[PDB]
Amino acid sequence: GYTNMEKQAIARQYLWPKQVRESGMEGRIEVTDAAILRVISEYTREAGVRGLERELGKIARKGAKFWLEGAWEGLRTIDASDIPTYLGIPRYRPDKAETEPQVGTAQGLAWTPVGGTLLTIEVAAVPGSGKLSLTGQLGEVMKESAQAALTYLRAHTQDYGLPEDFYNKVDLHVHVPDGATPKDGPSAGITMATAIASALSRRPARMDIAMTGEVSLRGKVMPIGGVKEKLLAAHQAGIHKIVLPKDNEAQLEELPKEVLEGLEIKLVEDVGEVLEYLLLPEPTMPPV
Amino acid sequence: GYTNMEKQAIARQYLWPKQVRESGMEGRIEVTDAAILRVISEYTREAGVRGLERELGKIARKGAKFWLEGAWEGLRTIDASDIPTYLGIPRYRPDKAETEPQVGTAQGLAWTPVGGTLLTIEVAAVPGSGKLSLTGQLGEVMKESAQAALTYLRAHTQDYGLPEDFYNKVDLHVHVPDGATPKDGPSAGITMATAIASALSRRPARMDIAMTGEVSLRGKVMPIGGVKEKLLAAHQAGIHKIVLPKDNEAQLEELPKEVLEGLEIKLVEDVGEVLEYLLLPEPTMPP
Amino acid sequence: GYTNMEKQAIARQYLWPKQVRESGMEGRIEVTDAAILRVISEYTREAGVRGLERELGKIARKGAKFWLEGAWEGLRTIDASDIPTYLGIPRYRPDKAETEPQVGTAQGLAWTPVGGTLLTIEVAAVPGSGKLSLTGQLGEVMKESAQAALTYLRAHTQDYGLPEDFYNKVDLHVHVPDGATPKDGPSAGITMATAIASALSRRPARMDIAMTGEVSLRGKVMPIGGVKEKLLAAHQAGIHKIVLPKDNEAQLEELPKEVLEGLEIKLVEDVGEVLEYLLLPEPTMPPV
Amino acid sequence: GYTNMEKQAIARQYLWPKQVRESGMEGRIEVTDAAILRVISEYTREAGVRGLERELGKIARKGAKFWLEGAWEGLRTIDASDIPTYLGIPRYRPDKAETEPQVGTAQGLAWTPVGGTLLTIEVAAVPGSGKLSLTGQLGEVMKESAQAALTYLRAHTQDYGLPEDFYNKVDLHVHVPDGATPKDGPSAGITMATAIASALSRRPARMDIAMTGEVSLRGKVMPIGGVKEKLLAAHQAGIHKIVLPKDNEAQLEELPKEVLEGLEIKLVEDVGEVLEYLLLPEPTMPP
């Protein structure tokens, strides 16, 4: 495909000019050369430029939304630091491939007698007849929290942009490595709703955020165990953003300050608050 | 069917020159008497010679594809040693019958209390309703890997030449001999995945490569253990090409130096890499 | 229900200010009491005010479109003359209920025994199994013109937003009053298209325009004979808007000038432009 | 959408060099600015350049066919005159919009007591249950002509790239304007097959060709009458490419030179020869 040098010249001469024209914002907005390169690096992975154009279309349209809030005379420049305001959270990370957003996955936290451990929840949505598969040596409580998470999503298809008929035209497989290691507890409920919704919606869930919390059928995020040991593993693993239930606000004193400084904790009650914070708004794959 | 000497003759007189004129490369390529024998032996299994005409067509078009990259003086002759460049990996192996590529099998490796073993996975894609059978005394974890491997392939029907309706028009049967010996663990996920795909796509999986590795749902190849015992089993079996997880690289420099230099170790971190290295491109059977 | 004085008040102190505010346009646009009165009379048919709230929403959102085209300093007052610029052609007229837009009906110019006659093509789409009645004493040419019109619409459900499985869940009935009088000719083909499309889409077709033109299967509006007699009949009937095939432009010279200057004539080539000009964008009845 | 000189510059500086480099023909072939404009105007109808990128790839690839067929010495520049050699028949004619290819239509030559006229057979294939409508005051011989054409195409679904189950999932409507004029005769048989095949296949039929010929179930294009007056009709209309039955070669001997002057006259035996010549290779609309 095109080199990065090539894509930038293409965007400057043609794609941006075109997308500003169609948005109706020509003369009012421009993008810096660094901003275009940031759009290529972090919001596209590609051979051609048919995705870069999409993002430049988004920038121009969000600019028209800003024009609605308040207009201005002359030009308004969008720099690389200003980009996340227009396109949202960076979809891709070349520098750190593991950190980037991903469909049908979610970061979870695990208690265990050795200390803290990270739990990756994988979910595959595939053509089928409404069957569910639960693997990774999951105990009955962990399977039941899955089912509850799934049923919430089945009762809220319109709210999260899920198919109106995934219940009987899709088979779901929730897998939790490592395959040999047994797993149990209600604590990965929201982590699993995040991953099931992600798979069904084709919208990639963020992996720089690690979460824990028990989900209920109507979507209440309830308290969980071992908050000290879970948050430590998050910090030792380089995760400095955490989702955590509201009613576990009191447990935070058990941390050693210095680590609690590093963490960025968002306290939650509804599972809707979580999915909002975890899921990117734009799907990156076809529906199925 | 014809004899081999007779199969060289229709190759030389008619089939080859036909396939070269049809590919627009006549006068600029030739194949040797030995090279044709090798196409007959290692690339065709038949009474007739349609597979031979099929394979000679590929030799000619690849000559056309090399003609694309650069022209040359006169005609370039293709000797028997060149054939794998033009036709890929040997599809058959008569002189050495036991490790030729096969549809629906793959070479896994096992840790057994008294030293390592060889683990052959067998898969049978038959007309059916979508049922899965997992036999050979398999522990729950090992059965979960077959399910994890199957789901990966169900989500990538386009990417590996799989049918788009095999989930409900095909019964699968994973079997792992020998029948009595119980087997367990997640260290055959890619082994399973490979055999399962090969069976559905009808593309032969190579049996001169021994692999081991836990597969995740979305396709990460994850670390495993037994590593040293396993790797002798391959060695003491005679297998020299070994697929292994990327994160397992730190266990290589354990076992003796001549044993390590004797093997060809491909490190993988994605099951797509494994399926590429293992499966031959063209399918040798009907769905 | 509500008196129009009551409605004007509700609009002035609640509906208008809520719709402008939620469109991000508060302080930039206003509507006169005359403008609001016109919306009630010519764009609503209800005892409540929910349609009125729908319409005022469209004015404010169309105001936001003008803001994107080009901003203005201060205030912009939408008067009664400007309403169709924002809302399009009037949906109703209480003063004379006969000549307002209607679902599944249209004005055509075609043959009866007197020859060159203004006809009304009635169409009803009801629940069914793909059956088509062609009543009103129609000759075969006219029956066949309806079939060509219907087939076109079956091949362009996406283009005009029709139910995509209507061909076997809906029965159609094309009726042309008055019942006793014979009708024939290809000249009402585009009227058929209009009235059928209107009935299937629930989008009311304008009845202040009479049209004439042979429709083709791919959608070409082909010329028609008797252009003089037809346009005289529309002139006699008190109909002052005409749709005519483009190839019949030469025939206009047959008319006297005093009659020709009473007729707003629109020349057409494709039936696609006929439907755009006749059908109000929004549907005014429940689907089928 | 991009303007024309813009589409040109982006084709020159990026797309063409890309497609030549990908086809492996870098340095070997070029295209003129006039020829690039012809690809835009005649072979694409679009806002962006996805159509243009597709076609410049076809030019590069059709160049790859030719270099294998035989090499040249230097850079072979492709002029606008040559573009149809690389891309086939123009899919659009913006300057002359009515003569361009269309799905479901075909030009017929009909004779009458007064003279000759051009028929246009319109055929729409829509979702249905196997019904057939025949409108335009068609007489019985002309209705049966459509039934013959349709039945032939039902028997040759594989041959002309038609849906296998179109007979019971699709309704057909054959329409022939003018709506009022009565019409009859077997002469429009091949003309109908063109239109029906075109409608079912979604392959555009050429509208710069007018034809005439009786069709038979097995597919023989049979001879006809009124060969003179039908050829004057094509002249009257501005059609200068004619399809005629092989058996009417003797009828063209009587014709004065001035009637045959200005006409390309393909003579056909099988109805499959007509569909070859009339229908474009690639379909435009979805099924």
PDB file of C-alpha atoms in Angstrom, chain D residues 18-204:
ATOM      1  CA  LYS D  18       0.239   2.243  -7.874  1.00  0.00           C
ATOM      2  CA  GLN D  19      -1.630  -0.073 -10.250  1.00  0.00           C
ATOM      3  CA  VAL D  20       1.347  -0.352 -12.629  1.00  0.00           C
ATOM      4  CA  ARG D  21       3.702  -1.144  -9.729  1.00  0.00           C
ATOM      5  CA  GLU D  22       1.281  -3.752  -8.330  1.00  0.00           C
ATOM      6  CA  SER D  23       0.867  -5.437 -11.739  1.00  0.00           C
ATOM      7  CA  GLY D  24       4.681  -5.597 -12.028  1.00  0.00           C
ATOM      8  CA  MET D  25       4.678  -3.456 -15.183  1.00  0.00           C
ATOM      9  CA  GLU D  26       6.664  -0.496 -13.784  1.00  0.00           C
ATOM     10  CA  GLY D  27       8.580   1.241 -16.587  1.00  0.00           C
ATOM     11  CA  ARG D  28       6.892  -0.843 -19.301  1.00  0.00           C
ATOM     12  CA  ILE D  29       3.604   0.991 -20.000  1.00  0.00           C
ATOM     13  CA  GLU D  30       2.090   4.473 -19.634  1.00  0.00           C
ATOM     14  CA  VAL D  31      -1.213   6.246 -20.294  1.00  0.00           C
ATOM     15  CA  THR D  32      -1.871   9.680 -21.809  1.00  0.00           C
ATOM     16  CA  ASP D  33      -3.875  12.424 -20.080  1.00  0.00           C
ATOM     17  CA  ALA D  34      -6.476  12.156 -22.858  1.00  0.00           C
ATOM     18  CA  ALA D  35      -6.732   8.397 -22.245  1.00  0.00           C
ATOM     19  CA  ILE D  36      -7.107   8.831 -18.465  1.00  0.00           C
ATOM     20  CA  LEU D  37      -9.973  11.272 -19.131  1.00  0.00           C
ATOM     21  CA  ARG D  38     -11.642   8.628 -21.332  1.00  0.00           C
ATOM     22  CA  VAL D  39     -11.464   6.114 -18.448  1.00  0.00           C
ATOM     23  CA  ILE D  40     -13.123   8.731 -16.196  1.00  0.00           C
ATOM     24  CA  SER D  41     -15.874   9.830 -18.591  1.00  0.00           C
ATOM     25  CA  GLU D  42     -16.711   6.577 -20.419  1.00  0.00           C
ATOM     26  CA  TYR D  43     -15.783   3.802 -17.947  1.00  0.00           C
ATOM     27  CA  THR D  44     -16.755   5.305 -14.550  1.00  0.00           C
ATOM     28  CA  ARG D  45     -19.782   7.103 -13.105  1.00  0.00           C
ATOM     29  CA  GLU D  46     -18.902   8.120  -9.568  1.00  0.00           C
ATOM     30  CA  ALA D  47     -18.126  10.783  -6.971  1.00  0.00           C
ATOM     31  CA  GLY D  48     -14.822   9.323  -5.739  1.00  0.00           C
ATOM     32  CA  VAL D  49     -12.217   7.213  -7.562  1.00  0.00           C
ATOM     33  CA  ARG D  50     -13.052   3.629  -6.522  1.00  0.00           C
ATOM     34  CA  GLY D  51     -14.294   2.928 -10.051  1.00  0.00           C
ATOM     35  CA  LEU D  52     -11.243   4.642 -11.564  1.00  0.00           C
ATOM     36  CA  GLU D  53      -8.832   2.682  -9.336  1.00  0.00           C
ATOM     37  CA  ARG D  54     -10.533  -0.578 -10.383  1.00  0.00           C
ATOM     38  CA  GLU D  55     -10.180   0.217 -14.102  1.00  0.00           C
ATOM     39  CA  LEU D  56      -6.573   1.490 -14.094  1.00  0.00           C
ATOM     40  CA  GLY D  57      -5.838  -1.859 -12.425  1.00  0.00           C
ATOM     41  CA  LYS D  58      -7.536  -3.604 -15.363  1.00  0.00           C
ATOM     42  CA  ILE D  59      -5.359  -1.578 -17.783  1.00  0.00           C
ATOM     43  CA  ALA D  60      -2.199  -2.565 -15.901  1.00  0.00           C
ATOM     44  CA  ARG D  61      -3.338  -6.209 -15.710  1.00  0.00           C
ATOM     45  CA  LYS D  62      -4.441  -6.391 -19.369  1.00  0.00           C
ATOM     46  CA  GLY D  63      -0.967  -5.008 -20.110  1.00  0.00           C
ATOM     47  CA  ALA D  64       0.398  -7.932 -18.073  1.00  0.00           C
ATOM     48  CA  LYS D  65      -1.498 -10.323 -20.386  1.00  0.00           C
ATOM     49  CA  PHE D  66       0.127  -8.687 -23.420  1.00  0.00           C
ATOM     50  CA  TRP D  67       3.778  -8.639 -22.167  1.00  0.00           C
ATOM     51  CA  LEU D  68       3.534 -12.408 -21.558  1.00  0.00           C
ATOM     52  CA  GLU D  69       1.962 -12.784 -25.020  1.00  0.00           C
ATOM     53  CA  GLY D  70       5.079 -10.957 -26.277  1.00  0.00           C
ATOM     54  CA  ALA D  71       7.518  -8.333 -24.955  1.00  0.00           C
ATOM     55  CA  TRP D  72       8.450  -4.900 -26.369  1.00  0.00           C
ATOM     56  CA  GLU D  73      11.472  -2.587 -26.328  1.00  0.00           C
ATOM     57  CA  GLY D  74      10.863   0.675 -24.444  1.00  0.00           C
ATOM     58  CA  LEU D  75       7.788   2.327 -22.928  1.00  0.00           C
ATOM     59  CA  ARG D  76       4.491   1.571 -24.701  1.00  0.00           C
ATOM     60  CA  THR D  77       2.229   4.630 -24.288  1.00  0.00           C
ATOM     61  CA  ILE D  78      -1.532   3.942 -24.350  1.00  0.00           C
ATOM     62  CA  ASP D  79      -3.643   6.553 -26.176  1.00  0.00           C
ATOM     63  CA  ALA D  80      -7.406   7.130 -25.756  1.00  0.00           C
ATOM     64  CA  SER D  81      -7.973   5.225 -29.016  1.00  0.00           C
ATOM     65  CA  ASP D  82      -6.435   2.124 -27.391  1.00  0.00           C
ATOM     66  CA  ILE D  83      -8.421   2.168 -24.110  1.00  0.00           C
ATOM     67  CA  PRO D  84     -11.218  -0.121 -25.395  1.00  0.00           C
ATOM     68  CA  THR D  85      -8.519  -2.709 -26.251  1.00  0.00           C
ATOM     69  CA  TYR D  86      -7.686  -2.667 -22.523  1.00  0.00           C
ATOM     70  CA  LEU D  87     -11.158  -2.169 -20.950  1.00  0.00           C
ATOM     71  CA  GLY D  88     -13.585  -3.499 -23.597  1.00  0.00           C
ATOM     72  CA  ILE D  89     -16.689  -1.638 -24.782  1.00  0.00           C
ATOM     73  CA  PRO D  90     -17.414   1.747 -23.107  1.00  0.00           C
ATOM     74  CA  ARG D  91     -19.941   1.284 -20.287  1.00  0.00           C
ATOM     75  CA  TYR D  92     -21.001   4.958 -20.550  1.00  0.00           C
ATOM     76  CA  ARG D  93     -21.494   7.629 -23.218  1.00  0.00           C
ATOM     77  CA  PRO D  94     -22.116  10.945 -21.368  1.00  0.00           C
ATOM     78  CA  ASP D  95     -22.103  12.941 -24.635  1.00  0.00           C
ATOM     79  CA  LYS D  96     -24.738  10.582 -26.105  1.00  0.00           C
ATOM     80  CA  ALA D  97     -26.617   9.239 -23.072  1.00  0.00           C
ATOM     81  CA  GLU D  98     -29.391   7.226 -24.793  1.00  0.00           C
ATOM     82  CA  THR D  99     -27.004   5.007 -26.813  1.00  0.00           C
ATOM     83  CA  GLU D 100     -25.177   3.706 -23.701  1.00  0.00           C
ATOM     84  CA  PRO D 101     -25.586   0.151 -22.279  1.00  0.00           C
ATOM     85  CA  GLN D 102     -28.695  -0.529 -20.151  1.00  0.00           C
ATOM     86  CA  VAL D 103     -29.929  -3.419 -17.996  1.00  0.00           C
ATOM     87  CA  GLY D 104     -33.108  -5.097 -19.265  1.00  0.00           C
ATOM     88  CA  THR D 105     -33.434  -3.290 -22.613  1.00  0.00           C
ATOM     89  CA  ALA D 106     -32.621  -4.157 -26.238  1.00  0.00           C
ATOM     90  CA  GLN D 107     -33.093  -2.571 -29.670  1.00  0.00           C
ATOM     91  CA  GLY D 108     -35.251  -4.384 -32.236  1.00  0.00           C
ATOM     92  CA  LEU D 109     -35.843  -3.661 -35.923  1.00  0.00           C
ATOM     93  CA  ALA D 110     -39.503  -3.922 -36.961  1.00  0.00           C
ATOM     94  CA  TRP D 111     -40.976  -3.498 -40.449  1.00  0.00           C
ATOM     95  CA  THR D 112     -44.442  -2.111 -41.249  1.00  0.00           C
ATOM     96  CA  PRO D 113     -46.577  -1.570 -44.393  1.00  0.00           C
ATOM     97  CA  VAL D 114     -45.360   2.076 -44.497  1.00  0.00           C
ATOM     98  CA  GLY D 115     -41.689   1.509 -43.600  1.00  0.00           C
ATOM     99  CA  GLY D 116     -39.343   0.465 -40.795  1.00  0.00           C
ATOM    100  CA  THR D 117     -39.162   1.425 -37.117  1.00  0.00           C
ATOM    101  CA  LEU D 118     -36.987   0.797 -34.071  1.00  0.00           C
ATOM    102  CA  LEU D 119     -38.541  -1.357 -31.336  1.00  0.00           C
ATOM    103  CA  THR D 120     -37.305  -1.163 -27.745  1.00  0.00           C
ATOM    104  CA  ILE D 121     -37.963  -4.296 -25.687  1.00  0.00           C
ATOM    105  CA  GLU D 122     -38.030  -3.465 -21.972  1.00  0.00           C
ATOM    106  CA  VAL D 123     -37.743  -6.281 -19.437  1.00  0.00           C
ATOM    107  CA  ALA D 124     -37.913  -5.927 -15.658  1.00  0.00           C
ATOM    108  CA  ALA D 125     -37.012  -8.834 -13.378  1.00  0.00           C
ATOM    109  CA  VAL D 126     -38.379  -8.300  -9.860  1.00  0.00           C
ATOM    110  CA  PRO D 127     -38.894 -10.427  -6.719  1.00  0.00           C
ATOM    111  CA  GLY D 128     -41.890 -12.714  -7.294  1.00  0.00           C
ATOM    112  CA  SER D 129     -43.226 -16.252  -7.741  1.00  0.00           C
ATOM    113  CA  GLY D 130     -42.557 -17.159 -11.403  1.00  0.00           C
ATOM    114  CA  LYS D 131     -45.104 -14.966 -13.200  1.00  0.00           C
ATOM    115  CA  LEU D 132     -44.636 -13.432 -16.656  1.00  0.00           C
ATOM    116  CA  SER D 133     -46.316 -10.256 -17.932  1.00  0.00           C
ATOM    117  CA  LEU D 134     -46.347  -9.359 -21.636  1.00  0.00           C
ATOM    118  CA  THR D 135     -47.571  -5.824 -22.414  1.00  0.00           C
ATOM    119  CA  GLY D 136     -47.547  -3.279 -25.259  1.00  0.00           C
ATOM    120  CA  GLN D 137     -50.499  -4.634 -27.269  1.00  0.00           C
ATOM    121  CA  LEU D 138     -48.457  -7.701 -28.245  1.00  0.00           C
ATOM    122  CA  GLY D 139     -50.070 -10.186 -30.636  1.00  0.00           C
ATOM    123  CA  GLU D 140     -49.977 -13.930 -29.961  1.00  0.00           C
ATOM    124  CA  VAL D 141     -46.995 -14.715 -32.230  1.00  0.00           C
ATOM    125  CA  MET D 142     -44.937 -12.053 -30.420  1.00  0.00           C
ATOM    126  CA  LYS D 143     -46.034 -13.325 -26.984  1.00  0.00           C
ATOM    127  CA  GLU D 144     -44.993 -16.872 -27.929  1.00  0.00           C
ATOM    128  CA  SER D 145     -41.679 -15.417 -29.155  1.00  0.00           C
ATOM    129  CA  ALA D 146     -41.019 -14.159 -25.603  1.00  0.00           C
ATOM    130  CA  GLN D 147     -41.983 -17.553 -24.134  1.00  0.00           C
ATOM    131  CA  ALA D 148     -39.497 -19.260 -26.474  1.00  0.00           C
ATOM    132  CA  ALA D 149     -36.716 -16.841 -25.508  1.00  0.00           C
ATOM    133  CA  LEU D 150     -37.468 -17.240 -21.789  1.00  0.00           C
ATOM    134  CA  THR D 151     -37.601 -21.059 -21.959  1.00  0.00           C
ATOM    135  CA  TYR D 152     -34.237 -21.158 -23.760  1.00  0.00           C
ATOM    136  CA  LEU D 153     -32.679 -19.039 -20.995  1.00  0.00           C
ATOM    137  CA  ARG D 154     -34.266 -21.271 -18.323  1.00  0.00           C
ATOM    138  CA  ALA D 155     -32.428 -24.241 -19.888  1.00  0.00           C
ATOM    139  CA  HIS D 156     -29.091 -22.352 -20.010  1.00  0.00           C
ATOM    140  CA  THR D 157     -28.774 -20.798 -16.532  1.00  0.00           C
ATOM    141  CA  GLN D 158     -25.131 -21.886 -16.130  1.00  0.00           C
ATOM    142  CA  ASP D 159     -24.135 -20.735 -19.629  1.00  0.00           C
ATOM    143  CA  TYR D 160     -25.198 -17.067 -19.313  1.00  0.00           C
ATOM    144  CA  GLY D 161     -24.620 -16.550 -15.567  1.00  0.00           C
ATOM    145  CA  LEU D 162     -28.252 -16.532 -14.437  1.00  0.00           C
ATOM    146  CA  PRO D 163     -29.697 -17.402 -10.999  1.00  0.00           C
ATOM    147  CA  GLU D 164     -30.468 -21.140 -10.853  1.00  0.00           C
ATOM    148  CA  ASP D 165     -33.893 -20.689  -9.221  1.00  0.00           C
ATOM    149  CA  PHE D 166     -35.091 -17.568 -11.083  1.00  0.00           C
ATOM    150  CA  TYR D 167     -38.080 -19.438 -12.568  1.00  0.00           C
ATOM    151  CA  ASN D 168     -39.892 -19.606  -9.183  1.00  0.00           C
ATOM    152  CA  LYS D 169     -38.382 -16.680  -7.205  1.00  0.00           C
ATOM    153  CA  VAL D 170     -38.699 -13.971  -9.897  1.00  0.00           C
ATOM    154  CA  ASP D 171     -41.530 -12.294 -11.811  1.00  0.00           C
ATOM    155  CA  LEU D 172     -40.770 -11.088 -15.344  1.00  0.00           C
ATOM    156  CA  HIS D 173     -42.430  -8.191 -17.176  1.00  0.00           C
ATOM    157  CA  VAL D 174     -41.808  -7.779 -20.912  1.00  0.00           C
ATOM    158  CA  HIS D 175     -42.928  -4.359 -22.173  1.00  0.00           C
ATOM    159  CA  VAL D 176     -42.696  -2.945 -25.707  1.00  0.00           C
ATOM    160  CA  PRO D 177     -43.625   0.708 -26.372  1.00  0.00           C
ATOM    161  CA  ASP D 178     -45.471   2.464 -27.796  1.00  0.00           C
ATOM    162  CA  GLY D 179     -48.162   1.335 -25.328  1.00  0.00           C
ATOM    163  CA  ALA D 180     -50.983   1.916 -27.841  1.00  0.00           C
ATOM    164  CA  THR D 181     -49.527   0.537 -31.115  1.00  0.00           C
ATOM    165  CA  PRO D 182     -50.428  -3.116 -31.832  1.00  0.00           C
ATOM    166  CA  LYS D 183     -47.382  -5.331 -32.473  1.00  0.00           C
ATOM    167  CA  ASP D 184     -46.950  -8.866 -33.811  1.00  0.00           C
ATOM    168  CA  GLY D 185     -44.446 -11.215 -35.463  1.00  0.00           C
ATOM    169  CA  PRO D 186     -41.618 -13.657 -34.652  1.00  0.00           C
ATOM    170  CA  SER D 187     -38.882 -11.215 -35.780  1.00  0.00           C
ATOM    171  CA  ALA D 188     -38.082  -9.840 -32.281  1.00  0.00           C
ATOM    172  CA  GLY D 189     -37.057 -13.213 -30.743  1.00  0.00           C
ATOM    173  CA  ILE D 190     -33.309 -12.664 -30.249  1.00  0.00           C
ATOM    174  CA  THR D 191     -34.031  -9.062 -29.255  1.00  0.00           C
ATOM    175  CA  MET D 192     -36.166 -10.324 -26.369  1.00  0.00           C
ATOM    176  CA  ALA D 193     -33.680 -12.926 -25.200  1.00  0.00           C
ATOM    177  CA  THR D 194     -31.136 -10.134 -24.985  1.00  0.00           C
ATOM    178  CA  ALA D 195     -33.473  -8.040 -22.834  1.00  0.00           C
ATOM    179  CA  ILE D 196     -34.606 -10.943 -20.616  1.00  0.00           C
ATOM    180  CA  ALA D 197     -31.092 -12.360 -20.140  1.00  0.00           C
ATOM    181  CA  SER D 198     -29.831  -8.829 -19.426  1.00  0.00           C
ATOM    182  CA  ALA D 199     -32.569  -8.302 -16.818  1.00  0.00           C
ATOM    183  CA  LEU D 200     -31.943 -11.644 -15.077  1.00  0.00           C
ATOM    184  CA  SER D 201     -28.130 -11.578 -15.286  1.00  0.00           C
ATOM    185  CA  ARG D 202     -27.894  -7.878 -14.329  1.00  0.00           C
ATOM    186  CA  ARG D 203     -25.469  -7.510 -17.272  1.00  0.00           C
ATOM    187  CA  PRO D 204     -26.056  -4.326 -19.318  1.00  0.00           C
TER     188      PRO D 204
END
